[PDB]
Every structure is written in C-alpha cells, then in structure tokens.
Design a protein around this ligand. Sequence first.
Ligand SMILES: COC(=O)CCCCCCCCO[C@@H]1O[C@H](CO)[C@@H](O[C@@H]2O[C@H](CO)[C@H](O)[C@H](O)[C@H]2O[C@@H]2O[C@@H](C)[C@@H](O)[C@@H](O)[C@@H]2O)[C@H](O[C@@H]2O[C@@H](C)[C@@H](O)[C@@H](O)[C@@H]2O)[C@H]1NC(C)=O
Lengths: 219, 217
Amino acid sequence: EVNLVESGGGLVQPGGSLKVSCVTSGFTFSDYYMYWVRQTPEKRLEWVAYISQGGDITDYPDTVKGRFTISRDNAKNSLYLQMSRLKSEDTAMYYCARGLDDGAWFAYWGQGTLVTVSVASTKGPSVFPLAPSSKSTSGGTAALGCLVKDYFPQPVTVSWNSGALTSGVHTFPAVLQSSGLYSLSSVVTVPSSSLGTQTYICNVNHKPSNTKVDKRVEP
Amino acid sequence: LMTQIPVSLPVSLGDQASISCRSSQIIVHNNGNTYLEWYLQKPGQSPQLLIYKVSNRFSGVPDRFSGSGSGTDFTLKISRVEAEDLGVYYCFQGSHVPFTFGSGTKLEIKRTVAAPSVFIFPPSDEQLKSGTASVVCLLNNFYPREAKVQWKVDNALQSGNSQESVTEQDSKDSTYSLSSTLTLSKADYEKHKVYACEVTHQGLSSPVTKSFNRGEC
Ligand SMILES: COC(=O)CCCCCCCCO[C@@H]1O[C@H](CO)[C@@H](O[C@@H]2O[C@H](CO)[C@H](O)[C@H](O)[C@H]2O[C@@H]2O[C@@H](C)[C@@H](O)[C@@H](O)[C@@H]2O)[C@H](O[C@@H]2O[C@@H](C)[C@@H](O)[C@@H](O)[C@@H]2O)[C@H]1NC(C)=O
C-alpha cells in the first residue's frame, strides 16, 4: 500500500543545519510532485516547499526561502529537505506529502519527524512507576502507569506490554515543566482481577537520547 | 490567505455542522477550478484529505461531507455528525502562492454529562530516593471539559507545585481525562502524612476529594 516515511530530525541548535528525508513506497515516485509541510507547536499548519518530478521546478514560502532546499532522488524514491540557518520558529513536525494528478495537494501524508530548535541539552527520561496500593482500587478496576519524568527534547513514546495493551491506555501529552524539562504520564485502567497474571509493563523510548527503558508496573 | 470561523464547534451526534473559510482574494488558478481543499486532523494523527477542488470528495470519504463556495467563501458541511468526525478541520488554498491553510476549527462531540473517576498516585520510592517525588491525581474519563483541581496537603492549598495534562476527546466515548502532579522534594512531602486532591465537576454535586496516607518501606 502507499505510504511515506520521514526521518532524520532531532535537536539542532539555532543557526545550525539539518537534513530530513522521506521514503516513498506504493506508487511511482517519479510521476508525482512532492511536498514538505510543517505543523508548529500551536498546531498551525504551513506549506514548506514542493518539487516537480524532474527536480528542476521548486518553490518555497518567503519565510523559508533561501534557508531551505527541497530535493529528491528518483533513483531511490526518496525526497529530502535540506534545512540551514535554523531558527527557533522552525521548530515543528515536518511531513512529506503526495498529491493527486486530479488536482489535489496533500492526498497522502507521512508520519512526520519532529525538529526541535534550541540551545537546550538532550536529557533522557526517568521512567518512574505509579503504585495502585489501595487508594485507587475502587472495586474491580483501578488505574496505574509510569511517570516519564524529566526529558528533552520531545518526543517520548510509551507502550504497554509492547503493544499488547491498546484499549484502556491513556498517555497524556507532555507538559514543559519549569526545569525546561518535559514530563508526561501514561495511565491505564485495568480490572483489579487482572493483577498478578496480567503482567503489565510500559516500554518508554526516547530515541533522541538512545534511551530504551522498560518498567513492569504492579499492585 | 485564509480566515476560518468558527474556532470551536460543539455539535451533537446526528447534528449538522458547517465550517467556512474566506480567502483574502478571490481564489482561482488557471480558471482550472478553484483549488480549495478541506483536511481533517484526527487527534494524534497526520491530517487527511476530505474534499478538493472545492467539492470533490477524495477517495474513501463518506458522503456526509460536502463542500461548496464562491468567490472567497467556502464551506464544509457534515450532514449527520458521527463519532469518528471529531478532530480539527483545516481549509487550504492552492490557487495562489503562498499556499495557505486556515487556522482550524475544532469539532467536539456534545455528549451526556459524565463524572471523572478521580485517583491519587503517591510517589514510588524509586523517585523518592532520587529526591523529587511527585503525587499524581488522575481525573479519568469525564465530560464536559470543565474541571477544577485543587491540592490539599494535610489542609494546605498548594498554589504552586502542580500542573495539568488534559487529553483530547476520546472517540470511544467522547470523554476527556486530566492529570495533575504535585511535584515535591523528599523533605516537603516527608513532612506531611496525608495528601488530598479535591475535584469539582459539573456532573459532580459534592466536590469529591482524594487523599492517601504517606508511608515508607
Ligand atoms: C494516475 O497516474 C498518475 O497520477 C501518474 C502521474 C501523472 C503522470 C505524469 C503527469 C505529468 C504532469 O505532472 C503535472 O505537472 C503539473 C505542472 O505542469 C503539476 O501542476 C502544478 O502543481 C504545482 C504544485 O502544487 C503548482 O500548483 C502549479 O501551479 C501546477 O501547475 C498548474 O496546474 C497544472 C495542472 C497545469 O494546469 C499547469 O498549467 C498549471 O501551471 C501537476 O500537479 C498536480 O496538480 C496540481 C494542481 C496540484 O494539485 C498537485 O498537487 C498535483 O500533483 C503534475 N501532476 C502530478 C501528478 O504531479
């Protein structure tokens, strides 16, 4: 099936440079105009650039004109976005998209790759637990989770029983604490009866610091 | 450019909804139709296409969605709002450079009032040893979004060591969840046995409180 995969972003400091890429699958890459779209933290959506099939025709909004450069390698069905002289405002989620011959811009979107632009320092998260000792057992269901404390930059991915616990999962969005550090909780509610047999573990992952932490939560 | 009104849109299931946009200038390309499109960004996902070229439904979009518009005003209409339709809608114009998006209209599903299941999670030793221990209070699956959370350490109103994390609406039942964390240093926390989290909600007549007894082992 058709899909796009962006990759290559992380923490870069102001004035620096980064090159995000996007890999095409499921369609004839060379037949389509490609796009680079971004969404800022305030969820504002902005168009970044486009490039013809040959690679000779491109354009960008003034806001990114001259610092950014879009390119594509038809040979490897990849699309690239060279970013230079990064500004903090450039901090966002970068998506690559494919349109329709018919007259549509973004019919297919990727997953996105988050580019953070600051003078801050990469720090791994401390995966703490939340113990449902007693003041939570309201009967035949209680809540529990792992508090992913102190980390930067975003993002941090959390999973339960490595994907073997979908429904019930409540992973809250990150909050930029005072320390300049993010923190978030991922709670889940489960039948008090499940405890013991149902081994519950949260697998945290903060790629930006190569932190791969697992934590078994229990009664 | 573009202007999208309304910002928020409370709608009941089955209801009809209308979101409109007005481009700064009459939007039309090589007369090759007006290239005005509508996107739906379901929560926690990338945006997706619904209608393009003012009214063409993209493949896979159900007919409850329709588009229209003239000169500078375009409207998206949902005849029967279903649960899956919650998220933020965006209009987009590709007839002129720069290609612009509308600021967005968040569609929230109006549901029957529900009470939050409050919970209190005291700090586990593993963070206590590290020093800073945080007590989290969970207000699970409620509606509306109006919820006040006050911290009562013994009986002190902590007007500082707390933060809030509110989720987006859940398509399974149209509820929200909220988490408030009282972040204390071993000492402050260690100094008091009981910690209370007081919840006040619309479906909550008598503001429920949630407290625990401090301990160690
Ligand atoms: C089903 O099979 C396929 O889809 C296989 C792919 C199609 C076969 C090869 C097609 C070769 C032609 O490719 C088209 O070139 C056009 C330019 O000549 C593109 O249109 C341009 O898109 C730019 C980026 O947004 C910008 O909007 C330009 O203004 C626009 O050109 C304008 O519109 C054209 C349709 C012409 O009328 C031209 O005179 C005019 O200047 C095509 O891009 C598609 O259409 C545009 C409107 C936009 O919706 C893009 O996202 C679409 O992809 C391009 N076709 C493709 C599939 O890329």
